[PDB]
Amino acid sequence: SAQLEGSYIFCMNPLLDKLSDEDIREQLKAFVTGKTDSIRTDTELSFDIYVSETDYALIRYADSLCERLNDAGADVQIKQYSGTMLRSRAVSGKYEAFLSESDLVSTDALENADYIILDSAEM
Structure with a gap:
């Protein structure tokens, strides 16, 4: 029900x-925004995506992604944590995505990272 x-x-x-x-990261950005539905890789791409367990709409979105x-x-997994835990992991770099x-x-924490802003209406 959360949106x-x-x-x-x-x-x-x-x-x-x-x-x-960088090219793989750019491919992932493009994939997440719908600009591509392909991930072209030499070898397998496998990584986790963390999400806050109280952002119910975002967990729904993440599961679909x-x-x-x-x-x-x-081979991607979604793993939920408290938002405070996610904040802490982002700062320490103990995360993949x-x-x-x-x-x-x-x-x-964001200045150390490689990210893209997504708009709710295009998600």
Whole structure:
């Protein structure tokens, strides 16, 4: 019953070996925004996406995105945590990717990362 509203971010940790290739990260951005439904990779792409467990609309969105990513041959999992835990993990870099309301995570944490702003109406 909760619905997506406002700005969200899809955020990747670029220092993670498996997401360290800029082209793969750009492909993922394009995929998440609907500009492509393909992920072209040399070897398998597998990563987790974290989401806050109290953002019910975003968990719904994330679960659906997971289905589309795995249909495209990725092996992605969604893992929910408290938002405070997600904030902490974003700051420490103990994450691969996450989705959040744009204002959830520390602006300092986002400056270390590679992210894209998503609009609710296009999600």
